């Protein structure tokens, strides 16, 4: 459990789960491989668990597990979306064996430079809300925020609802963006900024008319769409949207 964390940002201060100012400005943030580095190898651990699930639950050889995992991931943005639809997998049981079994407490540590950068972004007055927009389920999302010491830095969370049993609504699908817009109180896309490591997700935000979309590419792409700004480290946001950090 994480109830013994005492460092700043270790407590969630926004609500999980009525009009507002229309001129609202919102910066959306992906979480995985965004608020922490892809070199943490957390994504590798996730893929290991996911591939194990395909093998143990779908009785597939490792090579066929890779093919099916990649196929679903490519077209859906989440393998679990395909497992739900075609294999009648329960997404919450899956989630217990995958994201929720990661040894995060041994990997993620408070990220003070990230905390300070986000504080500066909140304090300029240029952005009204920092909103999390993740394909993870809420358990994992919250756990990452608390461990990284940034859980008080966001005004809300839009996560993929793994409780659904027909399909999952997730990035890069437009319905996921619509949900993020509604939940955050965002009136127009043109009042939104977005950072994500997924090229396809960035592609959707751009196509939808978001103001500025930043594609986070640490080393090599796992493709960057027309109109996106590329950085290799989230701490480079101050380099590329500098004005948002100034009063
Ligand atoms: N892949 C999945 O994608 C999610 C990460 O979502 P995001 O924060 O990058 O949008 C995690 O559930 C991971 O297992
Ligand atoms: Mg990601």
From Swiss-Prot:
GO terms for biological process: nucleotide catabolic process; pyrimidine nucleobase metabolic process. One of its GO terms (molecular function) is nucleotidase activity. Signal peptide: none annotated. It comes from the Eukaryota. Could be an enzyme that inactivates 6-azauracil by modifying it. Belongs to the SSM1 family. This is Suppressor of disruption of TFIIS. It comes from Saccharomyces cerevisiae (strain ATCC 204508 / S288c).
